[PDB]
Amino acid sequence: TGVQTFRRDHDRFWVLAAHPNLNLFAAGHDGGMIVFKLERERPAYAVHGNMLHYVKDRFLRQLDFNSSKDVAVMQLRSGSKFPVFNMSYNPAENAVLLCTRASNLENSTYDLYTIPKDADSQNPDAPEGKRSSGLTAVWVARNRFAVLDRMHSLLIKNLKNEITKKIQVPNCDEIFYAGTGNLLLRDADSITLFDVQQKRTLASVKISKVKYVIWSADMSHVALLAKHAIVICNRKLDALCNIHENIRVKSGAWDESGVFIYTTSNHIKYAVTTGDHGII
Amino acid sequence: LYTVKAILILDNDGDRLFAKYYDDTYPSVKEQKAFEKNIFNKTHRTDSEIALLEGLTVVYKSSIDLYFYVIGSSYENELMLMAVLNCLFDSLSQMLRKNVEKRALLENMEGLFLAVDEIVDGGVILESDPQQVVHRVAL
Amino acid sequence: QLFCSSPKAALRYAAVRTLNKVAMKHPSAVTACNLDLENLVTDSNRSIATLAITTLLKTGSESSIDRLMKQISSFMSEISDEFKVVVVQAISALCQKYPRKHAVLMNFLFTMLREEGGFEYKRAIVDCIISIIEENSESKETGLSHLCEFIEDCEFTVLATRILHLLGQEGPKTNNPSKYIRFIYNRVVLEHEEVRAGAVSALAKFGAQNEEMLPSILVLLKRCVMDDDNEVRDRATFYLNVLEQKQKALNAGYILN
Amino acid sequence: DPVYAEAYVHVNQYDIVLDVLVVNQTSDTLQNCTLELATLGDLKLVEKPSPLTLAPHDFANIKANVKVASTENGIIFGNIVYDVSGAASDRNCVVLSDIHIDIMDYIQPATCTDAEFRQMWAEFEWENKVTVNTNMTDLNDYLQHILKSTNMKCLTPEKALSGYCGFMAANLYARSIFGEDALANVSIEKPVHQGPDAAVTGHIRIRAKSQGMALSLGDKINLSQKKTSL
C-alpha cells in the first residue's frame, strides 16, 4: 500500500536503487542525486556465556564468534533483527527480555524469549517466554528498580529478579514525558536513583551515560558508557579513569568490571592490568 | 500651504536646472548643493515610492532623463502631494506633446517656468490638475 | 490597514511609528501578527522597509521569529532600499527596548550586530552603549564580557574613546576585579600611547575606590606596569610623578574631582 | 591473520617514517598485493621494500621513508587516502585516509620588535581566535608545557609579573617548516589563591593566514592546552 509520498525536488528521474551489498540506499534523478546512510546509532544487547548480543545501528546480527570475513550472528537469540525499543539480558545463559513493535505507540509488545529457543512471541505460560504489552523497559539506579513503561509513560518496574517484566504506575512523576534514559536520564545528565513511587528524590549523581550504563554482565557494571567517551568506574561513581578517543563510531571492551580492552588498529590491545598494559 | 521648500528639477548629475525655493529659510547656493548632494548622491537617480527625509516629505521623482525633487514636510499627505508631482509630468507631456528630457530641457527652460508659477506659487499650491491650465495657457 | 497594506498609501509606515500609536492590549496584540508579517515578508519598498521596523516593534515580537529574521536581515540590511538607515532607526529603537536589558537578547543581538555588521554598527553603538548606561545595566558581567571581547576584534578606536570615558567613572562599584583587570590590561595592550593611556585614566576613579582586593595591590601595580617611549615614558613617569607629588590618598581626592 | 601486520608511524627527525610490521605469520611468503607512490604534501612518499611474499610464520619490517620537504598535496591536515591493496594473497587490504597529522609540533618559535610587532599584530590575518579558559595547572608549568609541546615562542616579558597574579598578556610568535609565521596575543588571568587563575577566560587570538588552518591551530592548541584521554 502507498504509505506516503515524499517530495524533495527533481521533477524528473529514472532510477532508484538499493544496494545488493545493501550497504546504502540512494535515488537517482535528472537534476541530480542523493545517498542516505542508516543507523540506530547505538543499539541494544544481552550476554550469555562467551557470547555477545547486538542489536543493529545498521547491520544484522553479529552476535558472537566469527569464521571468515564478517559474520552476523544468526541464532535463536535474534538480536540485531527485530523492531527493538529495548533489549536487556534477563540473565541465565538461557533468558532475554525484548520489546518489539519498538517505537512510540500507546504501548508495544514485548515478547521475552528463551535462549534455548526464542520465538515470534515466546510462551506466556513459560516465564522465560512471556509477552505482554508495554512500550519500553529501562533500568534505573540502586540496581533492582527498573522502569517499565506500560502506559506510554512512567511505570516503574521493580523486581528482585531480573527476569522481570513488572508493571508499576506509582512513580508516575513526569516533568519529563515518555522519552529515553536508563538510569534515568531524560537527558538528566545524571543517573538518578529511586524505589517504586516516591515524590522526593533519593538522590541523583552528576555523571552521564551513552544513555546506557554498563554493567559487568548482568546488571552491576561500574563501567560506563557515554555516548562519545565512556567512563570507567567501578560500581557506581568512582571515576577510576575516564576514557576518550574521538572517532564517533566504535568500541572498547570490558571483561567484567573495568577490564580495559581497547582496540588498536590491526592490533587489539589491553589498555591495562595490575600495573600492566598489553597486546594480546 | 506656503509649503514648498523648493521644488527643483534637477539633473541627475546633481545639477539643478531649476530650483525655486518657494519657501526657504536656509541658504547658500553651495549649501543647497550640499544638501542636494547628500540626498541626491544617495538617491542617485533612484528615488523611492515614498521618501521622508528630515521628517519632511521628500517627494521626488525621476523621469527617463530628469530628477524631480520637491521638498515639503511630512506633515501633508502623499496622495495629494504626489498628485501635484504627477501633474507636473503629465501636463508637460501632453501639452508639449512631449514630457521632460535632458534635450528638451536644453532647448528651452521657459515653458517649465511658465507652468511652474502657475501651478504653484511659493509654499501654497494654488493648483494640481492640467486642464484648467491647458485652456488657460495658450502660449 | 489591509487595504493600504501594500503601498496604496506608502503612508502607512509612518503611522505605526506613532501617528497611529501601538503598544497594544493583550489579545489585541496576537491579532496583529499577519499584517506585520506581510511587510516583514515583502522586504521591499522604502515605504516597506520602514514599515517593517515600526510594525514589528510596536506590536513587539517573539524571540523565535527574530531568529529567522536575523538571517533575513543578514542579507537585507546593507542596501535593500538602503536598509541601513531604517535599520539604524530601528536599531535605535532596539537599544531602547532592550538597552543592555534582556541581556541575553542584547548579547544575541550583540553577536549578531557585530556579525551582520558591514561596519555600520559603530554608529549604532553610539546609541547602544548609551542605552546600556541608561539602564545602568547589571548583567554587565556578561554584557561587558561580550563588549570587551568583541570590541577586541570588532575594532574602531573611536568607540573605545567613548566607552573609556564611561568606564572611567564606573569601576569598583561593579566588582569582578580580576576580569576587569584582565580586560584592562588588554585594552592597553594595543599600541597607541593613546590606547594605552585610557586604562590609566579610567583607573583613577577606580583606583581611588579600590575593590574586592585593590588598595595594596593598587599601590603595587603602577610599579609593576611601567613604560618608556619618552612621552609615553613621560606618561608613566608623570602619572607617577603626579602620584609622586600628592599623598596618594589626597591625590586621588583632588584629581578625581 | 597469521600474517598480522601492525604498524605505526614514527617520525623521526623530519622524516616521517613508517614502521611496518608486516608479520607474515602466514603459512608462506603468501603472495602480496600492490602498493602505489604519490606526491604528497611538502613530502612525498618515497619508498617501498620491493618484494611481495608474506614469508611463512615470519616477521618483517617494512619501511617507508617518506620524503619530508616536498610533494604538495593540499589535502590539509593530511588526511588523505592511502592505499595498501588487495592485489595478491589478499582479496582486500586497507585503504585508509590518515588522520593523525597535526600542527602543534611543526611550527618552531620565532621572534620580533615589539612596537612593530604590535603594529603588526593588528596588521596580520586577524581572522582566528580560540579561548583559553580551563586546565589542571598554573600557566607557569602549564605555559611551559604548552610552549614545549608546540615548540613555539612567546616573544617578550614585562615584569608585571606572572606571579602575584600576573595580569599579563603574552605575545607569541612562531615560524614553521614550510614557513608560515603565526602571531598570538593571548590575554590571561593566572593562578594564585583567592586572586586570579585556575581557568582563564583569556582569549587566545590566533592569526594564521588561512582561517581554516588558523582557527584549527587555535583548536590544536586547544587540544594541546590540557592534558587528558585522547
Swiss-Prot record, chain A:
Entire-sequence positions represented here: 282 to 561 of 1224
Originating gene: Copa
Transmembrane feature ranges: none
Phosphoserine: residues carrying this PTM: 121
Role, per record: The coatomer is a cytosolic protein complex that binds to dilysine motifs and reversibly associates with Golgi non-clathrin-coated vesicles, which further mediate biosynthetic protein transport from the ER, via the Golgi up to the trans Golgi network. Coatomer complex is required for budding from Golgi membranes, and is essential for the retrograde Golgi-to-ER transport of dilysine-tagged proteins.
Record text on subunit structure and interactions: Oligomeric complex that consists of at least the alpha, beta, beta', gamma, delta, epsilon and zeta subunits. Interacts with SCYL1. Interacts with JAGN1. Interacts with TMEM41B. Interacts with SVEP1. Probably interacts with PEX11A.
Organism of origin: Mus musculus
Protein's cellular compartments: Cytoplasm; Golgi apparatus membrane; Cytoplasmic vesicle, COPI-coated vesicle membrane
Name assigned to this protein: Coatomer subunit alpha
Source organism superkingdom: Eukaryota
UniProtKB/Swiss-Prot annotation, chain B:
Transmembrane segments: none
Keyword Acetylation recorded: yes
One cellular component (GO) term of this entry: Golgi membrane
Keywords from the UniProt entry: Acetylation, Cytoplasm, Cytoplasmic vesicle, ER-Golgi transport, Golgi apparatus, Membrane, Protein transport, Transport
Function (record text): The coatomer is a cytosolic protein complex that binds to dilysine motifs and reversibly associates with Golgi non-clathrin-coated vesicles, which further mediate biosynthetic protein transport from the ER, via the Golgi up to the trans Golgi network. Coatomer complex is required for budding from Golgi membranes, and is essential for the retrograde Golgi-to-ER transport of dilysine-tagged proteins. The zeta subunit may be involved in regulating the coat assembly and, hence, the rate of biosynthetic protein transport due to its association-dissociation properties with the coatomer complex.
Full protein name: Coatomer subunit zeta-1
Protein localization: Cytoplasm; Golgi apparatus membrane; Cytoplasmic vesicle, COPI-coated vesicle membrane
Full-sequence range covered: 10 to 148 of 177
Record's subunit section: Oligomeric complex that consists of at least the alpha, beta, beta', gamma, delta, epsilon and zeta subunits.
Gene Ontology biological-process entries: intra-Golgi vesicle-mediated transport; intracellular protein transport; retrograde vesicle-mediated transport, Golgi to endoplasmic reticulum
Family, similarity comment: Belongs to the adaptor complexes small subunit family.
UniProt topology in membrane: Peripheral membrane protein
From Swiss-Prot, chain C:
Function: The coatomer is a cytosolic protein complex that binds to dilysine motifs and reversibly associates with Golgi non-clathrin-coated vesicles, which further mediate biosynthetic protein transport from the ER, via the Golgi up to the trans Golgi network. Coatomer complex is required for budding from Golgi membranes, and is essential for the retrograde Golgi-to-ER transport of dilysine-tagged proteins.
Binding partners and assembly: Oligomeric complex that consists of at least the alpha, beta, beta', gamma, delta, epsilon and zeta subunits. Interacts with ZNF289/ARFGAP2 through its C-terminal appendage domain. Interacts with EGFR upon EGF treatment; interaction is essential for regulation of EGF-dependent nuclear transport of EGFR by retrograde trafficking from the Golgi to the ER. The coatomer interacts with KDEL receptors; the interaction is important for retrograde trafficking of KDEL-bearing proteins from the Golgi to the endoplasmic reticulum. Interacts with COPB1. Interacts with TMED10 (via C-terminus).
Protein family: Belongs to the COPG family.
Identification of the protein by name: Coatomer subunit gamma-1
Organism encoding this protein: Mus musculus
Gene that produces this protein: Copg1
Residues shown, of full length: 293 to 549 of 874
Top-level taxon in the UniProt lineage: Eukaryota
Annotated HEAT repeat ranges: 1-28, 30-63, 64-100
Annotated compartments: Cytoplasm, Cytosol; Golgi apparatus membrane; Cytoplasmic vesicle, COPI-coated vesicle membrane
Curated annotation (Swiss-Prot), chain D:
Subcellular location: Cytoplasm; Golgi apparatus membrane; Cytoplasmic vesicle, COPI-coated vesicle membrane; Cell membrane
Superkingdom, natural source: Eukaryota
Residues included from the entire protein: 724 to 953 of 953
Assembly and oligomerization: Oligomeric complex that consists of at least the alpha, beta, beta', gamma, delta, epsilon and zeta subunits. Interacts with CAPN8. Interacts with SCYL1 and PRKCE. Interacts with COPG1. Interacts with ARF1 (myristoylated); this interaction is required for binding of COPB1 to Golgi membranes. Interacts (via trunk domain) with ARF1 (via switch I region); the interaction is direct. Interacts with KCNK2 (via N-terminus); this interaction increases the channel-mediated whole cell currents and promotes plasma membrane expression of KCNK2. Interacts with STX17. Interacts with TMEM115.
Tissues expressed in: Predominantly expressed in the upper one-third of the oxyntic mucosa and in most regions of the pyloric mucosa. Ubiquitously expressed including platelet, liver, heart, spleen, lung and kidney.
Extra remark beyond the main annotation: Brefeldin A induces dissociation from the Golgi of the beta-COP and presumably the other coatomer subunits.
Protein name: Coatomer subunit beta
